[PDB]
């Protein structure tokens, strides 16, 4: 169990850990470089460690010195990857999933996709992948997937009606896939995998991705997860007295939604192949918004909503995915134990800002959802309580940035 206490002022200079997408797609695209890739500031969570273990078992030689955050990775080209010996374990990662599932499906083995995930399916890549010629078993769970790898893949041009996992994964298969592979969709979505695509020399057309290419190695420096920094963002913005730099953060305008939102709300955000920046952020009042439906798009939106809690009026959004919908829900639970009058719709949410009291909130053993809640706790009038890998490492640079977490 996780208490907290009214924090007196956030202060000080932070690095966030480094961004998850951006480290699944840095080691799985260095792995099959052709040269050396150091990676910088990967982050050695267990998911993207988990993708280190698959590329291994594939013949990927891939140093790992955890401490530091740092790869080595010795790229094997792009036709170097190798049958794995056993299934590949996923572990608790969807992208090591889907990415593994654009990457394997055109390689000359099989392989078997193993991990914890089944409640989201997978017929979105499936579909896709299957029409470029991917011979896939996703019957009964999923995971586990097995993949008869057809080292004959054709291109295909792929209608997509908002989701960068697809195109992701999709954009993987076509550097297997014989001619132009090209995906439109009604408006951009996180460009990640085409970013490092350009970083390792890979040519794009903006998109469509050949097969035929070359990836060469490239240093990269993983920027900090503007996920995580988000949650100090709102922090240092709810709390009197509060100023706050956070070093290194990754700013891609496919990942601004909440940092757009705040600033819609009033909030003093000083922003300072992928756009990394400085942030420091001050003190200030907020005011309730209509959220544009396009905004959400661009994992961190729970804590949002406790920005919204602290503002003075309406903060509403009408017009999503199932997994946002349900994290809302916890939310409107969690925040209605704090005094505060939410209200779930249909179409979206309707928060009334107020006053955030101290009580007890079930985080649904979810780390946003917990962490979400530890940062009202900066401002809630008492100790919140939480019924709650990163956490821990969240709980140690939070408190020393006097944002109070106590895991007892």
Same mark, same amino acid.
């Given at each position: ?8 002022g956030?202060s ?10 951006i ?5 799985? /695209? ?32 891939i140093?790992?010195?955890?401490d530091?955050n ?12 190798? $049958? ?18 654009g ?14 995930l ?6 979105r890549?499936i ?14 769970n ?12 054709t291109?295909?041009h ?25 995906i ?27 097969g ?16 995580? $920094?988000?949650?100090?963002?709102? @922090? ?10 956070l ?5 891609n ?13 009033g ?11 400085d942030?420091?952020?001050?003190? @200030? ?8 439906p396009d905004?959400?798009? /661009?994992?961190?939106f ?6 919204? $809690? ?7 959004l009408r ?10 829900? @916890?939310?409107?639970?969690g925040?209605?134990? /704090?005094?505060?009058?939410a209200?779930?719709l ?25 962490? $979400?809640?530890?940062?009202?706790g ?31």
């Amino acid at each position: 169990d996780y208490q907290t206490i009214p924090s007196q002022g956030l202060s000080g200079e932070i690095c966030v850990p480094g961004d998850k997408s951006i480290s699944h797609r840095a080691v799985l /695209l260095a792995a099959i470089a052709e040269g050396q890739t150091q990676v910088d500031g990967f982050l050695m969570g267990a998911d993207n460690l988990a993708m280190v273990s698959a590329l291994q078992q594939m013949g990927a030689s891939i140093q790992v010195i955890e401490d530091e955050n740092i790869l080595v990775v010795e790229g094997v080209g792009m036709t170097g990857l190798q $049958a794995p010996p056993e299934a590949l374990d996923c572990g608790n990662s969807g992208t090591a999933i889907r990415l593994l599932s654009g990457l394997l499906a055109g390689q000359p083995f099989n392989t078997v996709l193993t991990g914890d995930l089944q409640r989201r399916p997978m017929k979105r890549i499936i579909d896709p992948l299957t029409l470029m010629g991917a011979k896939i078993d996703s019957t009964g769970n999923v995971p586990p997937l097995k993949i008869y790898g057809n080292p004959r893949l054709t291109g295909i041009h792929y209608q997509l009606p908002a989701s960068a996992q697809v195109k992701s994964c999709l954009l993987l298969a076509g550097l297997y896939a014989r001619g132009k592979t090209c995906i439109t969709e009604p408006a951009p979505s996180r460009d990640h995998t085409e970013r490092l695509l350009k970083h390792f020399h890979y040519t794009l057309q903006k998109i469509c991705v050949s097969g035929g290419g070359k990836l060469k190695a490239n240093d990269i420096s993983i920027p900090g997860d503007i996920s995580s $920094a988000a949650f100090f963002i709102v @922090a240092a913005t709810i709390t009197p007295g509060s100023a706050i730099r956070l070093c290194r953060v990754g700013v891609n305008p496919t990942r601004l939604g909440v940092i757009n939102l705040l600033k819609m709300m009033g909030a003093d955000i000083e922003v300072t192949e992928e756009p990394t920046a400085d942030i420091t952020v001050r003190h @200030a009042r907020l005011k309730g918004i209509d959220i544009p439906p396009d905004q959400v798009p /661009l994992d961190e939106f729970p804590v949002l909503l406790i920005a919204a $809690a602290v503002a003075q009026g309406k903060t509403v959004l009408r017009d999503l995915r199932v997994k946002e919908t349900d994290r809302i829900a @916890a939310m409107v639970d969690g925040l209605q134990k /704090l005094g505060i009058a939410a209200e779930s719709l249909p179409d979206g949410v309707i928060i009334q800002g107020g006053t955030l009291e101290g009580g007890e909130v079930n985080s649904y053993d979810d780390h946003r959802i917990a962490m $979400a809640f530890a940062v009202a706790g900066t401002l809630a009038k008492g100790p919140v309580r939480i019924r709650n890998t990163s956490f821990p490492n969240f709980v140690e640079l939070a408190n020393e940035v006097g944002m109070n977490v106590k895991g007892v």
